[PDB]
Design a protein around this ligand. Structure first.
Ligand SMILES: O=c1[nH]c2cc(C(F)(F)F)c(N3CCOCC3)cc2n(CP(=O)(O)O)c1=O
Lengths: 489, 147, 49
């Protein structure tokens, strides 16, 4: 048939309304046509959000798709919970159990708390913006008490447009004083770009600084500016550009025109636009599972106003909610599955990391297991481990008293063990104490002409250095290289 | 909303009433658009808002003044989300500038049957740094429930 | 532009600009950070003519 829906978009949702209309094309199957409405508004204005909600409610809609800010979030969930009109959003996930609101920005609280534990932080800063509740700040402050953190949260949300430069600059001078090398940027794409412009200008993207960007939009802001210098900026991302549905999308995304679909001639989609594209997938399949059970809905076309007093519900509204929350489609952001409340369950967040070649996935976080560290398990290109050979001789190498419960270079003690530690910190290497095999010092056989002992492991490649009581002789100097004598006798 | 619009039908010239954290935005936008004066004994809005007259003065200044008087550097700050988060943002910003060690904990998501259960787990975690300085940021009902 | 991008305008670096044109290029970009860039100038903007 045809399902009427609604639309609440900010003035400036260019790529989000573009990725909306793309999914209108690609997810039609012509048995039903989800004909939409458009009500471009200010999300941070509870008058306009109320006004546009009631108008659409008046004009017979079955699901309203929109964005909310933290100045309208309680206006949305109250109207959508009283009048049962289901609400699909990619905006920030609400703090609570607000029904009839189906939310697609999954959660980044558990992923952010897992990543700080991974790098073993105890002192950091938490530059945050108000911008979407304080639910992520409250999550890290509650975890600060029990996990021995020292958060130093400052409130980068109210900086005015003119005096931006002196305010950001005086801020990091304060972080300079208490030596905050580790910073977490809980802002959105616009204010993350404004902050990383300021850490470049005063020179704090050099080696020593770390920057987790608490955002599911890591490769959606300019990272090329901070890619060189030495900062170790990490982050999170839901849109993996190495998978089937996304790689098909970026092909047809790049071919579009920036005159009817604005901001749609690149190879990077913002995560708000991707979840907007994932929303029309869910809204299609939910009314398709409402076609599959032979269900028709809502003979109204009548309801004159939202403010009814007595507010009368409509019983099909529960059923539309039931359809929307059992939608296990897959899309740009992964396994789209909702709980009984409208909060996304099993899903995957790719912990990216910015390196000199580019951004680089180093793990993934899912709700079920934990942060699972992926490949790069082997590729490190270590310096070297140096095989140093000695012999069991007192006081040169003696096995320590409790050598059964020890392992590595600390099973042994003696003169040459203390000497090998001194050679290692002047030449700058890491060593592996290795007692010789045969038990000799080294002698060339008269028949086989084969060196044994510690001389034979340096000639034949089985060792790299012999820090040992090894006598400087004539026949050994011809085959190996001695130092100046560390002990004359 | 439905009570505000019933007042606007009957044509009043001032609306006296209370708001919450979940209705501060509804009031200040409806009063700022339909130009209707609003006198309130509830918490003062964080931000320049027209047409809303706040009768509760302020507490962000006096609370930061009293901490410096007792010369605190390591307290704990039990707070409650209802009546806002402005006083939390004040003491966290002044902690950076004055080297405090605030241990802010939300105590407002507590249901009234795990009430004793979570509060014993609450003061357990306060003995993890052995906090002897608490700032109850709640209103009368939850203050008496913590006392 | 390249000493900013790889982060070498921080404190410790000095940069004499052998040019009689010191305040004729963009110096605002490197003014903060810690570099101690000096230079030369013939046009004094504090005199009569
Ligand atoms: O390079 C050599 N370094 C050696 C060092 C030592 C030690 F003193 F323990 F350091 C000894 N010992 C001396 C007394 O008997 C027990 C072991 C023998 C060594 N030998 C064999 P040698 O020189 O033919 O006698 C070498 O060849």
């Amino acid at each position: 048939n045809s399902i009427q829906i609604g639309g609440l978009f900010p003035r400036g949702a260019d790529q989000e309304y573009s990725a909306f209309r793309v999914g209108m094309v690609q997810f039609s199957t012509s048995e039903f046509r989800l004909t939409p409405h458009i009500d471009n508004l200010e999300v941070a204005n509870s008058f306009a959000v109320t006004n546009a909600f009631c108008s659409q409610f008046s004009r017979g809609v079955y699901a309203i798709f929109g964005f909310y800010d933290k100045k309208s979030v309680n206006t949305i969930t109250s109207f959508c919970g009283t009048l049962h009109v289901s609400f699909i959003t990619p905006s920030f996930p609400t703090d609570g159990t607000h029904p009839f609101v189906i939310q697609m920005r999954p959660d980044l609280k558990g992923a952010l708390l897992s990543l700080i534990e991974y790098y073993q932080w105890d002192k950091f800063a938490y530059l945050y913006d108000s911008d979407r509740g304080l639910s992520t700040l409250q999550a890290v402050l509650d975890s600060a008490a029990e996990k021995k953190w020292q958060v130093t949260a400052i409130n980068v949300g109210n900086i005015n447009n003119d005096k931006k430069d002196e305010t950001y600059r005086s801020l990091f001078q304060d972080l300079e004083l208490k030596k905050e090398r580790r910073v977490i940027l809980d802002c959105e794409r616009d204010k993350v770009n404004d902050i990383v412009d300021q850490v470049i200008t005063i020179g704090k993207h050099v080696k020593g600084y770390h920057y987790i960007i608490a955002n599911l939009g890591f490769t959606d802001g300019d990272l090329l500016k901070i890619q060189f210098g030495g900062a170790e900026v990490s982050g999170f991302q839901i849109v993996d550009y190495d998978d089937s549905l996304v790689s098909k999308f970026i092909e047809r995304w790049s071919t579009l025109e920036e005159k009817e679909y604005p901001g749609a001639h690149t190879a990077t989609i913002k995560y708000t636009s991707a979840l907007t594209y994932d929303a029309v997938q869910v809204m299609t399949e939910a009314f398709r599972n409402l076609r599959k059970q032979r269900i028709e809905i809502s003979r109204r076309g009548n309801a004159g106003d939202c403010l009814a007093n007595p507010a009368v519900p409509w019983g099909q509204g529960v059923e539309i909610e039931r359809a929307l929350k059992q939608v296990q489609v897959e899309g740009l952001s992964g396994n789209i599955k909702f709980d009984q409340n409208g909060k996304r369950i099993n899903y995957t967040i790719n912990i990216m990391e910015l390196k000199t070649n580019g951004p680089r996935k180093i793990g993934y976080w899912s709700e079920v297991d934990k942060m699972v560290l992926t490949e790069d398990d082997t590729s490190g290109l270590e310096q070297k481990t140096v095989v140093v050979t000695t012999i069991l001789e007192s006081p040169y190498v003696m096995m320590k008293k409790n050598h059964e419960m020890l392992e590595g270079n600390e099973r042994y003690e003696g003169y040459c063990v203390d000497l090998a530690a001194e050679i290692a910190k002047h030449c700058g290497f890491k060593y592996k104490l290795t007692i010789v095999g045969d038990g000799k010092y080294g002698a060339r056989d008269a028949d086989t002409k084969i060196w044994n002992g510690m001389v034979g492991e340096l000639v034949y490649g089985k060792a790299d250095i012999a820090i040992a009581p090894l006598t400087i002789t004539l026949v050994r100097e011809e085959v190996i290289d001695f130092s100046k004598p560390f002990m004359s006798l």
